[PDB]
Symmetry: C2
């Protein structure tokens, strides 16, 4: 019990509340979730078919992106949310699932389910970087895209 | 200053050392990494093309599975390792990179590289469950396997 360890605990506790708020943001509130980020904050999808992240850079770019997300995922809900604090008061991981309609132009409407890991890094009590990690193959299934198969001959039984 | 907290600090420090040893295990030493697990411990890959985990259940099977892994990935190394402690002294996350030759039956020999998240849960100081999460698209690439391209029409820049 020193004031340095109290600052850290207080930081972790405020940061965790923002992670919880993030993960419970649904419907039209998603249009304001960008306000949880620093001005230069980054969010987006780190696991894509291309092998490069799609990074959305800036609090304002993030609010613009939320209009596209709400259109394409109109009823998205995160479930089975488990929040992991780390040794770093400004860095959290979340393991969860999610489910909802997927409405991408040039594909049929589908139902998308996946398992997700999210990384949340903070600066001054606001999110500086959010990254989502998932298995893009499940998104291919939701879009009617054929999923390649890797054969693992010899893989012990 | 309670011994229930010295109880956990001790568990966490010991477990962290087991995560470090796991993540630095290379070459022939991989044939013995299964000895870091509880008798009933589980390892494997949670992000597959099939959408289901390939879980390797038990110390003995993990030992048998390493023979396959060492053949298919003869020079595998994990790099850029970041270990994350959590509020649970028996739960850790690792973010890292990995690369090496990939040598599968029926595919041209390749070079596989990916970004990985590992989950490690402990029991009595041995690994009770290890799970790897990666982007399966990067492994398709390494095998010469075509990766479909998701189109995100209307996605802002
Ligand atoms: O899933 C995507 O293709 C996607 C890509 C970027 Br770029 C941002 C948000 C995306 N989707 C929402 C809803 C589903 C769960 N992940 C967040
Ligand atoms: O990568 C796989 O296809 C794979 C599948 C299972 Br089942 C166990 C180990 C596997 N590979 C090692 C080496 C490469 C990185 N990941 C762990």
């Amino acid at each position: 019990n020193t004031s340095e360890n109290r600052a850290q605990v207080a930081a972790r506790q405020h940061n965790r509340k923002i992670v919880e708020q993030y993960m419970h943001t649904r419907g039209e509130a998603r249009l304001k979730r960008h306000l949880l980020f620093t001005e230069d904050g980054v969010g987006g999808l780190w696991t894509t078919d291309s092998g490069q992240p799609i990074a959305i850079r800036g609090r304002e770019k993030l609010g613009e992106h939320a209009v596209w997300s709400l259109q394409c995922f109109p009823d998205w809900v995160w479930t089975d949310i488990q929040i992991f604090e780390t040794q770093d008061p400004n860095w959290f991981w979340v393991e969860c699932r999610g489910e909802g309609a997927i409405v991408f132009p040039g594909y049929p409407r589908g139902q998308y389910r996946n398992h997700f890991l999210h990384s949340f890094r903070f600066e001054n009590g606001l999110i500086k970087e959010q990254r989502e990690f998932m298995n893009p193959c499940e998104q291919f299934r939701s879009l009617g895209i054929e999923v390649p198969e890797v054969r693992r001959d010899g893989l012990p039984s």
